[PDB]
Design a protein around this ligand. Structure first.
Ligand code: FUC
Ligand code: FUC
Ligand code: FUC
Ligand code: FUL
Ligand code: FUL
Ligand code: FUL
Ligand code: FUL
Ligand code: FUL
Ligand code: FUL
Ligand code: FUL
Lengths: 312, 312
């Protein structure tokens, strides 16, 4: 056994670095703490233990994370929900983990809401633009809401009509160019887009099992988009855009069918051109991943440590 | 979601009472506490909350329980393993929960050992005779060991050669007449017997999936034995003895196939003539039970509450 909370949500980030790509993955432990595990290049995963707590949230809190580089180092933001269902934020400010300012706004979320977040523009010489996506209601047909950071937090848009407690994936495919993926009331994955001055319904859609967990990534100038969804104990699916949308396909290992446990979640990260990780929760209870190795294909990578309870 | 630890072991007891059957079920929460839920007759289950803690054990501790009536009320003993893999006991003494004497003995238990217990003889006018079954090693081919209460704790027998971390069911089919069920290295359920002065290999055997959880009950003068096994996300099996063994069969609901989650455990109780519950862990994470209802048959009964975390 491990200290990984069964049906914990997961969030993950990645950035390229001279010694090998840096990854961080966030997950909840049995005590409600949010833990971090770390990977540098292809070196074994580290962290994931009681010594790697970055914050706390309500048990079974949704999670989302973004990162950028600033003049003060690596910035990370981890979004979660407290025990009063207030949207909250933990900040890695380049040196330490602290509580961010979002919590003080007092944004109320639906108890079963998922979370997604994206960022663009932040650098050594430019401020970040963050968008956090959540829902206020657990009911079927509810909208997705957006919180906006540009120098301060303000309410953003609301759109869509979703499956109850829909999964949400969010990616900035270019500067101020946003794609949000969610499950509609008819269980289709749908796409909401912002290019310049308005939200509009995108051309992407895909039938999926009710209650899938959804992630989305993008890279490059093409741009390239990947949308992932998975129902626990079913296989992972990927839709790919590089100018058109393909027919979605399963990512799977014939020797290890349907490795995720029921009612679990996924997260994705990416960096370079291109490395991708798609995290999932399996027997153990283990934090696993699918990895795309750029010229080899998909495989299940090294298991991410998530603690070992006393007496084991 | 609930506060029921996923892959918690379970233990259950039952007795006849005026007003109807009394049942108690024991399970672990996310904090490693052992909680109790209660049922009287066919009224709703009660308990299962943070206010119903009876003890604590290592996370993912195995569990077993026995009960009898005494002059000072209902006696319950719950067996578990502490964080140092020492066999430990919680006592309901007719009025309150306290720590029992067994822990002071220092009986070391394999980290992945299961536990079973049986009792006979205890009454308002006679002392209990308790037997606890456990393993010292996790390895395939290990024996089952026995601890004995006869007014004090002493080491009893060891026997068998088991599947690694086998399930164990234990039942007293008559006064001082014991039947122990476990999974052997060929994955057959097998039976060890004590009638008078020695342990011997019983006639019962049955093929089963690798790594099943096992429980056993008995009643009456025939006597009647029921042995249960289940691999998580497969159906429950029952073998039945009424003078001879039947062909084991599934207990299942065609409208709710394989309701248990992977890698989970069962427990069984019985009392009267004849009431039986077989507990299992399902999505929720919920504590469920199969119920044997005379003249109706088997069905999934009312859900047992196991807490609701803050924010839900
Ligand atoms: C980019 C901003 O950084 C800090 O000021 C946080 O307190 C804010 O909530 C936001 O994440
Ligand atoms: C990048 C593309 O932008 C719009 O054309 C959408 O309709 C597509 O689905 C895709 O997101
Ligand atoms: C009550 C019966 O006792 C012995 O005959 C065993 O061999 C049987 O399997 C059964 O347990
Ligand atoms: C960017 C920082 O990397 C360091 O290695 C980690 O210890 C911090 O938690 C954070 O992820
Ligand atoms: C990129 C756009 O920025 C704006 O401030 C928001 O109001 C829109 O919803 C969108 O996020
Ligand atoms: C990066 C790789 O892109 C390819 O075209 C896809 O087929 C793979 O699944 C993966 O997303
Ligand atoms: C026999 C006793 O029943 C009481 O109602 C319960 O509160 C105790 O925990 C115990 O099970
Ligand atoms: C029968 C005995 O009752 C006592 O209260 C316990 O302390 C012993 O361990 C044993 O269970
Ligand atoms: C009923 C028998 O009681 C004895 O004391 C023990 O030595 C045996 O193993 C068995 O439990
Ligand atoms: C008590 C009942 O006995 C019958 O003989 C069996 O068929 C049922 O499964 C159940 O155990």
């Amino acid at each position: 056994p491990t200290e990984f909370l069964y049906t914990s949500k997961i969030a993950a980030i990645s950035w390229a670095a001279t010694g090998g790509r840096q990854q961080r993955v966030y997950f909840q432990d049995l005590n409600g703490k949010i833990r971090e595990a770390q990977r540098g290049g292809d070196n074994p995963w580290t962290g994931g233990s009681s010594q790697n707590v970055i914050g706390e949230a309500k048990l079974f809190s949704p999670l989302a994370a973004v990162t950028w580089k600033s003049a003060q180092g690596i910035q990370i933001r981890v979004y979660c929900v407290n025990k009063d269902n207030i949207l909250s934020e933990f900040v890695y400010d380049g040196s330490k983990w602290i509580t961010g300012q979002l919590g003080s706004v007092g944004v109320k979320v639906g108890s079963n809401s998922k979370l997604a977040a994206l960022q663009w523009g932040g650098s050594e010489s430019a401020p970040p633009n963050i968008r956090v996506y959540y829902q206020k209601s657990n009911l079927s047909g509810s909208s997705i809401h957006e919180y906006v950071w540009s120098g301060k937090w303000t309410a953003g848009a609301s759109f869509g009509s979703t499956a109850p407690g829909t999964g949400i994936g969010a990616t900035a495919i270019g500067p101020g160019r946003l794609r949000i993926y969610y499950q509609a009331t008819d269980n289709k994955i749908r796409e909401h887009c912002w290019d310049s001055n308005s939200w509009y319904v995108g051309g992407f859609s895909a039938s999926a099992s009710a209650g899938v967990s959804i992630a989305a990534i993008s890279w490059g100038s093409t741009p390239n988009i990947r949308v992932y969804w998975q129902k626990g104990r079913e296989e992972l699916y990927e839709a790919a855009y590089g100018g058109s949308w393909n027919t979605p396909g399963q990512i799977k290992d014939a020797s290890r069918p349907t490795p995720s446990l029921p009612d679990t979640f996924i997260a994705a990260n990416s960096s370079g051109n291109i490395d991708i990780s798609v995290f999932f929760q399996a027997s153990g209870v283990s934090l696993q991943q699918w990895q795309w190795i750029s010229g080899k294909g998909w495989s299940i990578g090294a298991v991410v440590p998530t603690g070992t309870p006393a007496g084991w």
